[PDB]
């Protein structure tokens, strides 16, 4: 339902957590890719 609340992942060099509303909250660093 996009994700389960409390899951974590990486998106390239950024870190993400699944919010209570089911979306990925991700940091905003620049990644050398």
């Amino acid at each position: 339902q996009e994700c389960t609340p409390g899951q974590t992942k990486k998106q390239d060099c950024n870190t993400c957590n699944c919010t209570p509303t089911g979306v990925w909250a991700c940091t905003r660093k620049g990644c050398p890719p």
Partner: protein
Amino acid sequence: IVGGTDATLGEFPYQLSFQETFIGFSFHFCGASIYNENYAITAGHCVYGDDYENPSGLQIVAGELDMSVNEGSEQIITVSKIILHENFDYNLLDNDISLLKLSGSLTFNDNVAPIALPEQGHTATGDVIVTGWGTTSEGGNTPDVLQKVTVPLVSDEDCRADYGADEILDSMICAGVPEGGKDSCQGDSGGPLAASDTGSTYLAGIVSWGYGCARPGYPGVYTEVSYHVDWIKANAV
């Protein structure tokens, strides 16, 4: 920065580029802000995992506008120490703030200058200006010229409808337009959100996180500096 325009040299004299050096290049990965001649303010997640007392290959660049041309005001100074908030939460981004101590002092001039803090507890309001060298669309390209965007603040309660009640802490501040299209993005982390409701420019937020960038209904989320002013003053020597 998504939906912005080009900055001018000296327009944002407090803006820093936070860079890591590798073979063949210096890589911008975060923004930062000048607090005083020896200290920068950035996000905690920009430094988590570093060798805090002996950081290697990290530097700031002050007086920068266009990364692809040396215009003469750039000041590159290596970072000598990182002071990460000791209650930083790497997952949920509570207390997402760090200081960078520089190995030497910045030279202040028209193009290089501190940004004032608010008073502890001040409530920022009005349109605010977010700046950085982040991507210009989600998943997009990065500009060589510093970008600026104006966005309104979104109340914590309104933002919690998007992200969840406990996901937005009071010590976070949200900014964006309901229709989307204006936001910070990847590479803007750690840089400034500047307000001016006191009649003068001050640092109201630090770029932190969001769902994507510039999406309708998903404002950017920032560390709210007025919750951490006493922390900053206690830790910047």
